[PDB]
């Protein structure tokens, strides 16, 4: 009878993880996606910005400005 | 029975946390958008007034001045 019992109330407990850790997949694949394209877009800002001012400034300047 | 009412009680909280967690997404997804926008504008406006206050002292200048 403890082995009936404990068969049903594991089957109960494992559809109730599935379904949570299914959801939970999902997302987390979503805050992923966004992660990463937040992370590029300030890196592409980032980028940009300074090659602009190291261009407008020129690169020879650069080479003697350090010391 | 406690199999039963936790499989309703279960369905019953993975609809609000799926809800909740989408429309926190969809929100964090427009305050994403906005920030790279407020990064882009910011920094365009700073590369901007860096290369026409070193176009205006010129680039010779600059060579020999730190020291």
């Given at each position: 009878?403890?082995?009936?019992?404990?068969?049903?109330?594991?089957?109960?407990?494992?559809?109730?993880?599935?379904?949570?850790?299914?959801?939970?997949?999902?997302?987390?694949?979503?805050?992923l996606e966004l992660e990463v394209s937040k992370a590029?877009?300030?890196?592409?800002?980032?980028?940009?910005?300074?090659?602009?001012?190291?261009?407008?400034?020129?690169?020879?300047?650069?080479?003697?400005?350090?010391?």
């Amino acid at each position: 009878l403890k082995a009936q019992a404990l068969a049903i109330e594991t089957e109960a407990e494992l559809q109730r993880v599935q379904k949570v850790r299914e959801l939970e997949l999902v997302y987390a694949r979503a805050q992923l996606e966004l992660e990463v394209s937040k992370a590029q877009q300030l890196a592409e800002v980032e980028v940009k910005k300074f090659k602009q001012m190291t261009e407008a400034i020129g690169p020879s300047t650069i080479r003697d400005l350090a010391v």
